[PDB]
Amino acid sequence: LKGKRVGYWLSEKKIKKLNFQAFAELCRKRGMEVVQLNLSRPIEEQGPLDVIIHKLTDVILEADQNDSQSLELVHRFQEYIDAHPETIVLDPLPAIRTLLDRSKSYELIRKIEAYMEDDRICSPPFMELTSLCGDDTMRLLEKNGLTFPFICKTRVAHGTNSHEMAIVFNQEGLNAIQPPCVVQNFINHNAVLYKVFVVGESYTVVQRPSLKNFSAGTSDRESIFFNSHNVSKPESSSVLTELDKIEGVFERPSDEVIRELSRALRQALGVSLFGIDIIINNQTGQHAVIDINAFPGYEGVSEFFTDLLNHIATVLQG
Numbered sequence: 001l002k003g004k005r006v007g008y009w010l011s012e013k014k015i016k017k018l019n020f021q022a023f024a025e026l027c028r029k030r031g032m033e034v035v036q037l038n039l040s041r042p043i044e045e046q047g048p049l050d051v052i053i054h055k056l057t058d059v060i061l062e063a064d065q066n067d068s069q070s071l072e073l074v075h076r077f078q079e080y081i082d083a084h085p086e087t088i089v090l091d092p093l094p095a096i097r098t099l100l101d102r103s104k105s106y107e108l109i110r111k112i113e114a115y116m117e118d119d120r121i122c123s124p125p126f127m128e129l130t131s132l133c134g135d136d137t138m139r140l141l142e143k144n145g146l147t148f149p150f151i152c153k154t155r156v157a158h159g160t161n162s163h164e165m166a167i168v169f170n171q172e173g174l175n176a177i178q179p180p181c182v183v184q185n186f187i188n189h190n191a192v193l194y195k196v197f198v199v200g201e202s203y204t205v206v207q208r209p210s211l212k213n214f215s216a217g218t219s220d221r222e223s224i225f226f227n228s229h230n231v232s233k234p235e236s237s238s239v240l241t242e243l244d245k246i247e248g249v250f251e252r253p254s255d256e257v258i259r260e261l262s263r264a265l266r267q268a269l270g271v272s273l274f275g276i277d278i279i280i281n282n283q284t285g286q287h288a289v290i291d292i293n294a295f296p297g298y299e300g301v302s303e304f305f306t307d308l309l310n311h312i313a314t315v316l317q318g
């Protein structure tokens, strides 16, 4: 492992929160060379590279919106990868584009559920709402299987305000929707969120606070705006987190379901650094995947730096 050379492009915001500069010094003591890539230079000038770990989703977004600077950056990384199929990429770019779009990620999940054909997994119905359409909006939502209450989220799952959401309970509360957005059926789950952090083959299930239970169907409740990251941070104390009482099924996630679901995501995308947000439907007992996260923060995850080396050492053994 000594002499192996790894490069990385991360946002100093990913970097700081992962404490990535400390992890780079961790690897240099193991015998590695860890280089912070300059995407001003051609990347061949910084080679050779055995592993490239990155999260360029925010360059990827700009490049799709015809930003000259960002398409230039994406080009040079892609043409470096074609000229170097030996360099390991964590993670491939087609997986980045999929996970930054909530509509694409939610559709990917529903297809993987049909793949496993296991009655323990389910996805809440969803649809992309590019615009509201008058006094009759719900009939458009009813044809995609959506009922009150549902959650409005941003349709791009990265950047500022991408965690700002709103839960709508009745016809009066449709003005809370701000399109274009993604709407998703709200699932009662006894205010427990199981965040599954995946680093290659090893994974960690972290239990987090979540939204409390509400009445199924239509309620006389005003729409509630919240921040999903703030609500489910390793500890929030919110009016939305305080559960009233246990209602319906309250079981703990099946370890077999998490493992088989993690494999199906790594096979479908080639992704190896990601997180799965899972809630337990208190109303059928099924595992409900509500969001996918590309290379997340791994906030306070036990033994993350150790699992990250073992992953980097694992991919280099092939």
Ligand SMILES: Nc1ncnc2c1ncn2C1CCCC1
Binding pocket: 124, 151, 184, 185, 186, 187, 188, 189, 193, 209, 210, 211, 228, 231, 232, 279, 290
């Ligand atoms: N469909 C859904 N049902 C319930 N909760 C959901 C959800 N989608 C996202 N969440 C978040 C969990 C943490 C806070 C809100």
